[PDB]
Design a protein around this ligand. Structure first.
Ligand SMILES: C[N+](C)(C)C[C@H](O)CC(=O)O
Length: 599
């Protein structure tokens, strides 16, 4: 947004070596053995010894920060996503489920879909004009650069590493979106000649023509190719755009402000697994026979409107971060409720261009391969959506406790109860207080948390002592959260030293080849909060085979949880973890309330 605003932002810092290495050792203690900790302790010293390797790398990062807006920007985007060759589906692109809608027929589906498009465009006008209210936290400005990445962009396959294209602010910014129905894509202009955007009514009419221009699911699901392994997809992608029409269709999708998916009717399932499936539809689409082919997963923003009223979205992480999405969601959902205006007399409206795809025996073979790959993926994903009705932010806040810290500590209590030990845990922290900041790591497994979980279950340790261990565990977490937000966390900084070493062509340092670093970066628990005003929830796959993906939205009197795991690992089960997590949240409340402070 405002130039003055972004110009006042502090630039991402490089924390002091001794600081980050100290925090590093503290965070390792709860997850490694003493031998492993002792050895890592020795390696940590050698790394920071006078005139040693650590210093040369450290100064490298400091120089790097003087010559760049953000010393970590390109590096994070590159190593976390563009270089991640796993399919973006389930493994990277977050899935979001919005509050169900009440439409009961097709027309209601097109109507809502239309309202939503107008909603996003209203949100877009604010971003174009730079009128979107500048944001703050505690009184510190927050970078607004993430709002410019989510629209009119698209991930691009690469034989070695992908890339991201953005056209929001080009000479001829896009004015069309892409709509896909029954696997067929269309190019729909959402603005008139005079810049004014179409209306909810003008949109609905266009979507109707599209619906008609694809009555049957009688075409190849080209789009499903975007969900295969990035290396496989890069080859199939290249072979796909060897054709002029294909290339032109693809090109149209890449520049489209965003994509809207009008899903087809799917079989009915028992109620107790209904939410689970809906999430599946938003996360991955359900598979080859359902709506997976009704997607273009490279697209930064994909809004999904189900046939049964459900709806949600899925964004590609390369160019999308949490904050923008949350803001867009809240603003759009609210807009779809704001009463319209008298129908703007209808003016002549063109036919939405259909983006055809010439199929060849090779393009068709890749598609069959993509169906098969995705199918395996879905069959391995274990999801359990938990709606914690017991309480939300109200309880923790009435106890003068941060709800996020509380939930995180509950999760630690739940994991320990199941496995009898703690594990490397990750919780997304927003680095937005700094120019171009995306995220840093908050480590939920701490000295205090383990102390709390052990004691919590120790028959000898008194309830009163348990409650004190709990309060310490929560506060420790909150502090870490605040620290990570101010750039005092250490994970990104450690990554930087390593990358700096590689860049300078220096032998990989011992500190990184260390078993302890392998364990510290192997996140059996991957988490993130979605602090939305809308009663929605996010979800994503575990970052490790034997791990869980947990995402939550704390509401006032309840909490929306998503828990994911992989079937290929017998030691992890979604339901069980969700079941324990609930019990952990409740035992924590019971414990807190039975041992108050004073009167
Ligand atoms: C899901 N997870 C934590 C892997 C990615 C986060 O949503 C974004 C981040 O932490 O950079």
């Amino acid at each position: 947004s405002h130039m003055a605003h972004q110009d006042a932002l502090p630039r991402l810092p490089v924390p002091p070596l001794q600081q980050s290495l100290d925090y590093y050792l503290k965070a390792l203690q709860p997850i490694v053995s003493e031998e492993e900790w002792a050895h890592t302790k020795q390696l940590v010293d050698e790394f920071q010894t006078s005139g040693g390797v650590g210093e040369r790398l450290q100064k490298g990062l400091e120089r790097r920060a003087k010559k760049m807006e953000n010393w970590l920007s390109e590096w994070w985007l590159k190593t976390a996503y563009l270089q991640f060759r796993q399919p973006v589906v389930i493994y990277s692109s977050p899935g979001v489920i919005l509050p169900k809608q009440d439409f009961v027929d097709l027309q209601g589906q097109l109507r809502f879909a239309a309202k939503l498009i107008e909603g996003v465009l209203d949100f877009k006008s604010m971003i174009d004009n730079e009128t979107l209210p500048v944001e703050f936290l505690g009184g510190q400005p927050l970078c607004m650069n993430q709002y410019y990445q989510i629209l009119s962009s698209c991930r691009v396959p690469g034989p070695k590493q992908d890339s991201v294209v953005n056209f929001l602010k080009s000479k001829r910014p896009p004015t069309h979106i892409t709509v896909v129905h029954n696997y067929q894509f269309f190019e729909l202009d959402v603005y008139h000649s005079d810049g004014t955007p179409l209306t909810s009514d003008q949109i609905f009419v266009q979507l109707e023509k599209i619906w008609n221009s694809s009555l049957q699911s009688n075409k190849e699901p080209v789009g499903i190719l975007t969900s295969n392994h990035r290396n496989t997809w890069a080859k199939a992608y290249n072979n796909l755009i060897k054709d002029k029409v294909n290339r032109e269709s693809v090109n149209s999708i890449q520049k489209s402000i965003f994509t809207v998916c009008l899903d087809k009717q799917v079989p009915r399932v028992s109620d107790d697994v209904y939410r689970n499936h809906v999430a599946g539809q938003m996360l991955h689409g359900g598979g080859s026979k359902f709506n997976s082919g009704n997607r273009w997963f490279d697209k930064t923003l994909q809004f999904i409107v189900a046939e049964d009223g459900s709806c949600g979205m899925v964004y590609e992480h390369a160019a999308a971060e949490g904050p923008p999405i949350v803001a867009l969601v809240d603003h759009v959902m609210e807009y779809t409720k704001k009463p319209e205006l008298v129908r703007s007399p209808m003016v002549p409206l063109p036919m939405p261009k259909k983006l055809r795809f010439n199929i060849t025996p090779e393009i068709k073979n890749d598609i069959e391969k993509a169906k098969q790959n995705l199918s395996i993926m879905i069959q391995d994903l274990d999801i359990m959506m938990l709606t914690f009705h017991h309480f939300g932010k109200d309880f923790p806040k009435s106890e003068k406790l941060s709800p996020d810290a509380f939930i995180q500590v509950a999760l630690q209590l739940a994991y320990y109860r199941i496995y009898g030990q703690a594990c490397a845990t990750y919780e997304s922290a927003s680095l937005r207080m700094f120019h171009l900041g995306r995220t840093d790591t908050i480590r939920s497994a701490s000295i205090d948390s383990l102390a709390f979980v052990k004691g919590m279950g120790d028959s000898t340790v008194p309830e009163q002592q348990k409650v004190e261990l709990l309060r310490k565990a929560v506060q420790a977490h909150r502090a870490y959260t605040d620290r990570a937000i101010r750039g005092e966390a250490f994970d990104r900084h450690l990554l930087g030293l390593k990358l700096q070493a590689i860049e300078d062509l220096v032998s990989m340092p011992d500190i990184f080849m260390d078993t302890s670093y392998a364990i510290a970066m192997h996140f059996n628990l991957s988490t993130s909060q979605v602090p939305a005003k809308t009663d929605c929830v996010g979800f994503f796959g575990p970052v490790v085979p034997d791990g869980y993906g947990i995402c939550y939205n704390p509401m006032e009197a309840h909490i929306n949880f998503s828990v994911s795991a992989y079937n290929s690992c017998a030691e992890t089960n979604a339901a069980r973890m969700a079941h324990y997590l609930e019990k952990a949240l409740l035992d924590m409340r019971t414990l807190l309330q039975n041992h108050p402070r004073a009167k």
